[PDB]
Structure formats: C-alpha cells, structure tokens
Amino acid sequence: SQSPTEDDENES
Amino acid sequence: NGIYIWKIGNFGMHLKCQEEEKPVVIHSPGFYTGKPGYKLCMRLHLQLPTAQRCANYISLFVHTMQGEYDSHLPWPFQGTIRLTILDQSEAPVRQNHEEIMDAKPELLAFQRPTIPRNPKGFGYVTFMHLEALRQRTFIKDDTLLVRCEVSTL
C-alpha cells in the first residue's frame, strides 16, 4: 500500500 | 527471473554526506534478467534533510538500460519487480524492508532505452526512512544490501 512513481534522474 | 544483490559498502560515509546536506545519488552496476534478457540497474538516493516532503528518505528506482539483447527482446518491458533492503540479522529475527511494483508497459521508463541508461526510472521516492534503518540490523559491517528480483519471462 505505497505506489511507485516515475522519476526522471535529470530533474535534480 | 533474475536476482541481483547490490552491495553498497562504506555506507557510514554516504550517511555522513547526507547529514551534511551533500547529495548522495548512486547507481548499481547493470544486471541482466537473463542471457538473453533485459539490462537494468537501480538508482538510490539519500534525500537531503532540506528536501521538502521526502527529507531523510532512501529513494530507490529501477532503470532500464541498453543491453546486448535489446533487438531480440519484446518491448516495452513488462514484469514484476521486487525491491528489498535486506535485514542482515539471523533468519529467526529477520524482517526485510520490501516493496513490489508492476512494470506497467505504458510508462516511459519501460520503453526500449535509446541511450545507455533510460533517465526515467521507476520506484519509490520514500522507499525507506533513514531512521527505520536503526530499528533493525540493516547495516552490517558498514554495508547495505539492496536486492532486486525481476519476474519477467
């Protein structure tokens, strides 16, 4: 009961 | 059905970095779900104490990589990934910290990568809080163990 997420590694 | 254990050693130093608000972003070596199979890696963050909602969390993402078999494999990628931080105590008193995700083939993250590593990863910004680490023996001999298990076909 925790959702995974798309994460761009360049949005840093 | 590939399994990879990522041994992150010298972990106290990465923690000391995070405490000083120096970013910590590390990537696992690339591993294959099979030979033939997909190439993947993990990306791990220690979010800074200054990092808004996810301060002091371990972030854990899976990334798709250009692999020797890419032209023979079906795309987009589809499967079930299990991400686990291993509790390094003896089996009776052991509880791993674990999440299971479904690689949904419509995400950008699971399309066939066109550069060495797909920048779009897929995982958990708030995978595990750093203070949860101190609740069991997750760090043993200065080493965290991050296991990735891909059920594909």
PDB file of C-alpha atoms in Angstrom:
ATOM      1  CA  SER A   1       0.000   0.000   0.000  1.00  0.00           C
ATOM      2  CA  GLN A   2       2.533   2.521  -1.319  1.00  0.00           C
ATOM      3  CA  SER A   3       2.568   3.452  -5.015  1.00  0.00           C
ATOM      4  CA  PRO A   4       5.662   3.542  -7.227  1.00  0.00           C
ATOM      5  CA  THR A   5       6.480   6.605  -9.291  1.00  0.00           C
ATOM      6  CA  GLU A   6       8.216   7.596 -12.489  1.00  0.00           C
ATOM      7  CA  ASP A   7      11.209   9.766 -11.585  1.00  0.00           C
ATOM      8  CA  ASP A   8      13.489  11.475 -14.087  1.00  0.00           C
ATOM      9  CA  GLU A   9      17.050  11.334 -12.757  1.00  0.00           C
ATOM     10  CA  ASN A  10      17.866  14.605 -14.578  1.00  0.00           C
ATOM     11  CA  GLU A  11      15.242  16.617 -12.666  1.00  0.00           C
ATOM     12  CA  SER A  12      17.856  17.211  -9.952  1.00  0.00           C
TER      13      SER A  12
ATOM     14  CA  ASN B   1      13.606 -14.452 -13.264  1.00  0.00           C
ATOM     15  CA  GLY B   2      16.763 -12.511 -12.402  1.00  0.00           C
ATOM     16  CA  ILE B   3      18.016 -11.635  -8.933  1.00  0.00           C
ATOM     17  CA  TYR B   4      20.659  -9.039  -8.112  1.00  0.00           C
ATOM     18  CA  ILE B   5      22.081  -8.075  -4.730  1.00  0.00           C
ATOM     19  CA  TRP B   6      23.637  -4.617  -4.722  1.00  0.00           C
ATOM     20  CA  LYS B   7      26.311  -4.344  -2.026  1.00  0.00           C
ATOM     21  CA  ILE B   8      26.621  -0.683  -1.010  1.00  0.00           C
ATOM     22  CA  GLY B   9      29.625  -0.542   1.298  1.00  0.00           C
ATOM     23  CA  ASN B  10      31.333   2.344   3.057  1.00  0.00           C
ATOM     24  CA  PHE B  11      27.798   3.294   3.982  1.00  0.00           C
ATOM     25  CA  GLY B  12      28.602   5.356   7.079  1.00  0.00           C
ATOM     26  CA  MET B  13      30.365   7.830   4.791  1.00  0.00           C
ATOM     27  CA  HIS B  14      27.353   8.147   2.489  1.00  0.00           C
ATOM     28  CA  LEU B  15      25.260   8.762   5.617  1.00  0.00           C
ATOM     29  CA  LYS B  16      27.678  11.390   6.872  1.00  0.00           C
ATOM     30  CA  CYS B  17      27.399  13.040   3.448  1.00  0.00           C
ATOM     31  CA  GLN B  18      23.612  13.103   3.661  1.00  0.00           C
ATOM     32  CA  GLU B  19      23.794  14.602   7.155  1.00  0.00           C
ATOM     33  CA  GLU B  20      25.932  17.432   5.811  1.00  0.00           C
ATOM     34  CA  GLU B  21      23.422  18.135   3.035  1.00  0.00           C
ATOM     35  CA  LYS B  22      25.719  16.858   0.285  1.00  0.00           C
ATOM     36  CA  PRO B  23      23.666  14.888  -2.260  1.00  0.00           C
ATOM     37  CA  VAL B  24      24.080  11.127  -2.470  1.00  0.00           C
ATOM     38  CA  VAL B  25      23.000   9.511  -5.747  1.00  0.00           C
ATOM     39  CA  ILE B  26      24.451   6.110  -6.595  1.00  0.00           C
ATOM     40  CA  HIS B  27      23.706   3.577  -9.309  1.00  0.00           C
ATOM     41  CA  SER B  28      24.039  -0.154  -9.098  1.00  0.00           C
ATOM     42  CA  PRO B  29      26.054  -1.966 -11.748  1.00  0.00           C
ATOM     43  CA  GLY B  30      23.900  -3.104 -14.635  1.00  0.00           C
ATOM     44  CA  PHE B  31      22.472  -6.606 -14.368  1.00  0.00           C
ATOM     45  CA  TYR B  32      20.558  -8.835 -16.783  1.00  0.00           C
ATOM     46  CA  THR B  33      17.249 -10.586 -16.134  1.00  0.00           C
ATOM     47  CA  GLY B  34      18.708 -13.462 -18.138  1.00  0.00           C
ATOM     48  CA  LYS B  35      21.091 -14.202 -21.001  1.00  0.00           C
ATOM     49  CA  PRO B  36      19.211 -13.322 -23.192  1.00  0.00           C
ATOM     50  CA  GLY B  37      17.282 -10.789 -21.093  1.00  0.00           C
ATOM     51  CA  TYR B  38      16.884  -7.142 -20.204  1.00  0.00           C
ATOM     52  CA  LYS B  39      19.579  -4.956 -18.700  1.00  0.00           C
ATOM     53  CA  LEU B  40      18.534  -2.969 -15.616  1.00  0.00           C
ATOM     54  CA  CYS B  41      20.141  -1.071 -12.772  1.00  0.00           C
ATOM     55  CA  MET B  42      18.973   0.584  -9.578  1.00  0.00           C
ATOM     56  CA  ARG B  43      19.338   4.205  -8.542  1.00  0.00           C
ATOM     57  CA  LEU B  44      19.496   5.079  -4.841  1.00  0.00           C
ATOM     58  CA  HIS B  45      19.163   8.484  -3.142  1.00  0.00           C
ATOM     59  CA  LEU B  46      19.679   9.666   0.366  1.00  0.00           C
ATOM     60  CA  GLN B  47      17.313  12.630   0.220  1.00  0.00           C
ATOM     61  CA  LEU B  48      18.746  15.701   1.882  1.00  0.00           C
ATOM     62  CA  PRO B  49      17.373  16.949   5.220  1.00  0.00           C
ATOM     63  CA  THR B  50      16.361  20.053   3.264  1.00  0.00           C
ATOM     64  CA  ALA B  51      14.366  18.073   0.665  1.00  0.00           C
ATOM     65  CA  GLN B  52      10.727  19.104   1.322  1.00  0.00           C
ATOM     66  CA  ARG B  53       8.361  16.130   1.786  1.00  0.00           C
ATOM     67  CA  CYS B  54      10.885  13.322   1.342  1.00  0.00           C
ATOM     68  CA  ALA B  55      13.713  14.641   3.536  1.00  0.00           C
ATOM     69  CA  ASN B  56      15.815  11.835   5.073  1.00  0.00           C
ATOM     70  CA  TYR B  57      14.370   9.050   2.932  1.00  0.00           C
ATOM     71  CA  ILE B  58      16.136   6.419   0.904  1.00  0.00           C
ATOM     72  CA  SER B  59      14.847   6.678  -2.670  1.00  0.00           C
ATOM     73  CA  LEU B  60      15.156   3.535  -4.779  1.00  0.00           C
ATOM     74  CA  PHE B  61      14.414   3.420  -8.507  1.00  0.00           C
ATOM     75  CA  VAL B  62      14.849   0.806 -11.199  1.00  0.00           C
ATOM     76  CA  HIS B  63      16.248   1.973 -14.550  1.00  0.00           C
ATOM     77  CA  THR B  64      16.149   0.404 -17.964  1.00  0.00           C
ATOM     78  CA  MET B  65      19.498   0.130 -19.780  1.00  0.00           C
ATOM     79  CA  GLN B  66      20.749  -0.565 -23.293  1.00  0.00           C
ATOM     80  CA  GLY B  67      21.561  -4.268 -23.331  1.00  0.00           C
ATOM     81  CA  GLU B  68      23.232  -6.738 -25.651  1.00  0.00           C
ATOM     82  CA  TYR B  69      19.880  -8.446 -26.282  1.00  0.00           C
ATOM     83  CA  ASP B  70      17.644  -5.424 -26.861  1.00  0.00           C
ATOM     84  CA  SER B  71      16.836  -6.109 -30.524  1.00  0.00           C
ATOM     85  CA  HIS B  72      15.728  -9.687 -29.730  1.00  0.00           C
ATOM     86  CA  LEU B  73      13.536  -8.817 -26.776  1.00  0.00           C
ATOM     87  CA  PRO B  74       9.903  -7.689 -26.660  1.00  0.00           C
ATOM     88  CA  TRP B  75       9.278  -4.022 -25.891  1.00  0.00           C
ATOM     89  CA  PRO B  76       8.083  -2.252 -23.912  1.00  0.00           C
ATOM     90  CA  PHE B  77       9.339  -4.080 -20.827  1.00  0.00           C
ATOM     91  CA  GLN B  78       6.739  -5.888 -18.718  1.00  0.00           C
ATOM     92  CA  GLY B  79       7.090  -7.714 -15.437  1.00  0.00           C
ATOM     93  CA  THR B  80       7.099  -7.698 -11.676  1.00  0.00           C
ATOM     94  CA  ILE B  81       9.992  -6.172  -9.749  1.00  0.00           C
ATOM     95  CA  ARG B  82      10.619  -6.757  -6.068  1.00  0.00           C
ATOM     96  CA  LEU B  83      12.850  -4.224  -4.292  1.00  0.00           C
ATOM     97  CA  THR B  84      14.170  -5.216  -0.888  1.00  0.00           C
ATOM     98  CA  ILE B  85      16.551  -3.789   1.669  1.00  0.00           C
ATOM     99  CA  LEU B  86      17.945  -6.811   3.434  1.00  0.00           C
ATOM    100  CA  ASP B  87      17.733  -7.240   7.184  1.00  0.00           C
ATOM    101  CA  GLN B  88      21.176  -8.690   7.934  1.00  0.00           C
ATOM    102  CA  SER B  89      20.311 -10.499  11.169  1.00  0.00           C
ATOM    103  CA  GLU B  90      19.943 -14.264  11.604  1.00  0.00           C
ATOM    104  CA  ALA B  91      16.752 -15.658   9.959  1.00  0.00           C
ATOM    105  CA  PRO B  92      14.685 -16.053  13.196  1.00  0.00           C
ATOM    106  CA  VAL B  93      14.778 -12.331  13.973  1.00  0.00           C
ATOM    107  CA  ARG B  94      14.766 -11.106  10.362  1.00  0.00           C
ATOM    108  CA  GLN B  95      12.331  -8.713   8.649  1.00  0.00           C
ATOM    109  CA  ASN B  96      13.307  -7.314   5.267  1.00  0.00           C
ATOM    110  CA  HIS B  97      12.053  -3.916   4.119  1.00  0.00           C
ATOM    111  CA  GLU B  98      10.390  -4.575   0.802  1.00  0.00           C
ATOM    112  CA  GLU B  99       8.082  -3.277  -1.955  1.00  0.00           C
ATOM    113  CA  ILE B 100       6.618  -4.937  -5.051  1.00  0.00           C
ATOM    114  CA  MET B 101       5.819  -2.967  -8.192  1.00  0.00           C
ATOM    115  CA  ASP B 102       4.366  -3.834 -11.581  1.00  0.00           C
ATOM    116  CA  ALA B 103       6.373  -2.565 -14.508  1.00  0.00           C
ATOM    117  CA  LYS B 104       3.471  -1.106 -16.430  1.00  0.00           C
ATOM    118  CA  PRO B 105       4.412  -1.149 -20.137  1.00  0.00           C
ATOM    119  CA  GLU B 106       2.926   2.278 -20.775  1.00  0.00           C
ATOM    120  CA  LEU B 107       5.475   4.185 -18.676  1.00  0.00           C
ATOM    121  CA  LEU B 108       8.310   5.968 -20.441  1.00  0.00           C
ATOM    122  CA  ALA B 109      10.579   4.134 -18.003  1.00  0.00           C
ATOM    123  CA  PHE B 110       9.933   0.755 -19.626  1.00  0.00           C
ATOM    124  CA  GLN B 111      10.235   1.720 -23.264  1.00  0.00           C
ATOM    125  CA  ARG B 112      13.266   0.431 -25.106  1.00  0.00           C
ATOM    126  CA  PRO B 113      16.174   2.638 -23.986  1.00  0.00           C
ATOM    127  CA  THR B 114      17.888   4.693 -26.663  1.00  0.00           C
ATOM    128  CA  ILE B 115      20.841   5.821 -24.517  1.00  0.00           C
ATOM    129  CA  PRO B 116      22.950   3.789 -22.025  1.00  0.00           C
ATOM    130  CA  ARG B 117      20.501   4.338 -19.176  1.00  0.00           C
ATOM    131  CA  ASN B 118      16.913   5.474 -19.518  1.00  0.00           C
ATOM    132  CA  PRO B 119      16.691   8.674 -17.418  1.00  0.00           C
ATOM    133  CA  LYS B 120      13.111   7.840 -16.479  1.00  0.00           C
ATOM    134  CA  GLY B 121      13.338   5.475 -13.540  1.00  0.00           C
ATOM    135  CA  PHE B 122      10.501   3.839 -11.683  1.00  0.00           C
ATOM    136  CA  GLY B 123      10.329   3.251  -7.954  1.00  0.00           C
ATOM    137  CA  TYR B 124       9.865   4.895  -4.574  1.00  0.00           C
ATOM    138  CA  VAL B 125      10.910   8.385  -3.555  1.00  0.00           C
ATOM    139  CA  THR B 126      10.076   7.479   0.024  1.00  0.00           C
ATOM    140  CA  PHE B 127      11.169   3.840  -0.103  1.00  0.00           C
ATOM    141  CA  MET B 128      12.568   3.725   3.450  1.00  0.00           C
ATOM    142  CA  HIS B 129      13.224   6.390   6.070  1.00  0.00           C
ATOM    143  CA  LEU B 130      16.814   6.613   7.303  1.00  0.00           C
ATOM    144  CA  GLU B 131      15.639   6.263  10.898  1.00  0.00           C
ATOM    145  CA  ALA B 132      13.925   2.966  10.100  1.00  0.00           C
ATOM    146  CA  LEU B 133      17.468   1.762   9.309  1.00  0.00           C
ATOM    147  CA  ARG B 134      18.355   1.968  13.009  1.00  0.00           C
ATOM    148  CA  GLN B 135      15.384  -0.191  14.007  1.00  0.00           C
ATOM    149  CA  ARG B 136      16.928  -3.468  12.744  1.00  0.00           C
ATOM    150  CA  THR B 137      20.375  -4.578  11.614  1.00  0.00           C
ATOM    151  CA  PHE B 138      20.130  -3.347   8.044  1.00  0.00           C
ATOM    152  CA  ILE B 139      23.671  -2.005   8.060  1.00  0.00           C
ATOM    153  CA  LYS B 140      26.167  -4.695   8.967  1.00  0.00           C
ATOM    154  CA  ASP B 141      29.910  -4.204   8.528  1.00  0.00           C
ATOM    155  CA  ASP B 142      29.252  -0.784   7.000  1.00  0.00           C
ATOM    156  CA  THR B 143      27.274  -2.395   4.160  1.00  0.00           C
ATOM    157  CA  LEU B 144      23.693  -2.041   2.991  1.00  0.00           C
ATOM    158  CA  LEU B 145      22.313  -4.813   0.784  1.00  0.00           C
ATOM    159  CA  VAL B 146      19.680  -3.911  -1.804  1.00  0.00           C
ATOM    160  CA  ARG B 147      18.125  -6.910  -3.557  1.00  0.00           C
ATOM    161  CA  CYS B 148      16.234  -6.601  -6.844  1.00  0.00           C
ATOM    162  CA  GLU B 149      14.166  -9.505  -8.160  1.00  0.00           C
ATOM    163  CA  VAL B 150      12.642  -9.285 -11.638  1.00  0.00           C
ATOM    164  CA  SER B 151       9.914 -11.693 -12.653  1.00  0.00           C
ATOM    165  CA  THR B 152       9.620 -11.331 -16.414  1.00  0.00           C
ATOM    166  CA  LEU B 153       9.551 -14.322 -18.838  1.00  0.00           C
TER     167      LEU B 153
END
